[PDB]
């Protein structure tokens, strides 16, 4: 008993310690704690879709010492790409205090705040991202004027244009942001995420027919973009193609929790919100057999 009691006792003790330190209510069911010390699981995995248990592996390796920038940026990026942007905010806010380095921090953080409604903190995060860059280091109005003061300077600068597009998305000016992403993506036609952010500014522009044309082959780049298929679901809902939208939302719920989630449940991380996309959907079909009754 003594030979292995510590392996679990100290594990639970440090888990609860990390729980009560700052944030991030860890999932109780890891089945990774005894083999998560070779952090390279996330590098061996997630290269071919299946970006669900890779987040679990990164959580299992981040339950250790918290002074690693990679362990606090990979979780944020994966969770943002997994459409669970609830704990990503707090995790990356914890990553904030680990120095203004790791410019991946403050880059997805602008996206992270503009995700739900956080207009105010997104501008501060984007400004902090911009100032933490010595190459060109030399209030919405001031924030956009600072970005406009560079434009041609660093012409390629894909991250700067991505930040500009994200900021433009917050101003409800999707028309100009549409052509921003259109000419931005052609510079690097490799990363599908820049394509994804394109489709959004076409989806919000009441032009879903073009927007889907952006997503489709982008899904071929990495068939793990839950956000892309969420966009397909909402576009099919907008086209009044309700049966196909229902099929797509069911597939989205299946794929998003497509892992050990039934046997590895935590605090549900407000996944009910995603489930809400299903809700009122049958309101178009009036599927009286199921309706709200299966909300559990």
């Amino acid at each position: 008993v003594e030979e292995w009691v510590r392996e679990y006792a100290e594990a639970q003790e440090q888990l609860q310690r990390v729980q009560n330190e700052t944030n991030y209510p860890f999932e109780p069911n890891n089945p990774y704690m005894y083999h998560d010390k070779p952090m390279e699981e996330g590098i061996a995995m997630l290269q071919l879709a299946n970006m669900a248990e890779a987040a679990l592996a990164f959580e299992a390796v981040c339950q250790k010492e918290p002074e690693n920038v990679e362990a606090w940026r990979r979780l944020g990026t994966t969770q943002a790409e997994n459409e669970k942007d609830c704990l990503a905010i707090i995790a990356l806010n914890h990553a904030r205090m680990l120095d203004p380095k790791d410019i991946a921090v403050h880059a997805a953080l602008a996206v992270s705040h503009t995700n739900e409604h956080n207009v105010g903190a997104a501008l501060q995060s984007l400004r902090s991202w911009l100032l933490s860059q010595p190459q060109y280091e030399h209030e919405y109005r001031d924030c956009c004027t600072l970005l406009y003061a560079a434009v041609e300077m660093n012409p390629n600068d894909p991250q700067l244009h991505a930040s500009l597009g994200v900021l433009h998305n917050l101003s409800h000016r999707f028309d100009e942001a549409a052509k921003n992403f259109r000419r931005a993506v052609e510079l690097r036609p490799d990363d599908a995420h820049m394509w994804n952010k394109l489709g959004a500014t076409l989806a919000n522009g009441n032009r879903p027919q073009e927007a889907l044309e952006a997503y489709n082959r982008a899904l071929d780049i990495n068939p793990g973009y839950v956000r892309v298929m969420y966009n397909m679901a909402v576009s099919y809902s907008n086209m009044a193609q309700y049966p196909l939208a229902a099929k797509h939302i069911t597939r989205a719920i299946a794929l998003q929790a497509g892992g050990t989630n039934p046997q590895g449940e935590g605090s549900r991380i407000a996944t009910r919100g995603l489930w809400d996309l299903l809700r009122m959907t049958l309101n178009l079909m009036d599927r009286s057999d199921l309706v709200e009754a299966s909300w559990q």
Binding site: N115, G120, K197, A200, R279, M280, E292
Partner: protein, 323 residues
């Protein structure tokens, strides 16, 4: 006895609405106010009006908007009637959809906060457009699971008022109190039933003109107001009068009969049309039918419901891009 709450105060349809409500709210009641800016303003400014027996409360908020504001979910407790009257100004461009694309979102927020502390308060929608905002409010209430179709009143009496004022100016010495108006509340979704009113009635050509004007009036204002502003005042009286109708009833001092925008419980298609209704202590208790109409009126109604069928579908599908 009652606690009326105003949410879109002080913008351009605020202070006037609160002032109108203050001078007619029954004795022994409280009036609340709220806005992101100016909350410590007009709220203290109206404390100099005596109106013995009336107490005024207020609550402020951070200038950067925040979903589920902690300060907002303090004053919402204890209220009985809500007036969601918060909107945005009308810039010269303001193309369709995009403007709506803004006006929906805030409204949804203004429903999520004040819904987990009092799911028994009669609601009211004033934000322009109203033909599409009401389905958004209905679905937002349906998300939590506490929804009562009997209290989903939508302000469209500005329409009623308009009609009376015109048909009472042609037929001069004669005067009518109210004129029925079924349909919705925008453009070709408004049918003024001018043939159920007591009197001799003018000719056809004229009736036609008067009719159409009821439909395209807002324009006049917007225009006259040198490409700025909208229609605050008028849109306030309507709101005030209606609110009272509701309040009195609830207490048991009158059983009024109005004409609201309440979901249709199995009535003539178009589940969010405007039909005459009678109020009561529990909201709406009976829905009167449209009644007999002539050939001319049914020509507009047969196509107006088609326009409503498009806005009603665009309404209860709001999910912009998540991301």
């Amino acid at each position: 006895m009652v606690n009326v709450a105003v949410i879109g105060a002080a913008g351009g349809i605020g202070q006037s609405l609160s002032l109108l409500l203050l001078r007619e709210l029954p004795f022994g009641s409280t009036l609340s106010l709220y806005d992101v800016v100016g909350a410590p303003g007009v709220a203290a400014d109206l404390s100099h009006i005596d109106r013995a027996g009336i107490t005024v409360k207020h609550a402020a908020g951070k200038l950067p908007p925040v979903p589920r504001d902690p300060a907002l979910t303090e004053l919402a407790e204890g209220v009985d009637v809500f007036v969601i009257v918060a909107g945005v100004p009308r810039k010269p461009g303001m193309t369709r959809d995009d403007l709506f694309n803004v006006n929906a979102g805030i409204v949804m927020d203004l429903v999520l906060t004040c819904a987990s502390v009092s799911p028994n308060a009669c609601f009211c929608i004033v934000t322009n457009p109203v033909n599409s905002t009401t389905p958004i409010a209905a679905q937002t209430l349906r998300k939590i699971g506490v929804y009562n179709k009997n209290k989903l009143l939508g302000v469209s009496l500005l329409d009623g008022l308009r009609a009376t004022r015109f048909i009472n100016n042609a037929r001069h010495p004669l005067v009518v109190p109210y004129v029925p108006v079924v349909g919705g509340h925008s453009d070709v979704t408004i049918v003024p039933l001018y043939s159920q009113i007591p009197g001799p009635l003018p000719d056809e050509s004229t009736l036609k003109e008067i009719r159409k004007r009821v439909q395209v009036a807002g324009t006049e204002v917007v225009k006259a107001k040198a490409g700025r502003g909208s229609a605050t005042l008028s849109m306030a009286e309507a709101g005030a009068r209606f609110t009272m109708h509701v309040v009195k009833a609830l207490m048991g001092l009158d059983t009024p009969m109005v004409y609201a925008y309440v979901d249709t419980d199995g009535e003539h298609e178009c589940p969010f049309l405007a039909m005459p209704v009678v109020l009561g202590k529990n909201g709406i208790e009976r829905r009167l039918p449209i009644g007999p109409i002539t050939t001319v009126e049914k020509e507009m109604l047969e196509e107006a419901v088609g326009v409503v069928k498009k806005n009603i579908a665009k309404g209860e599908t709001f999910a912009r891009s998540k991301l």
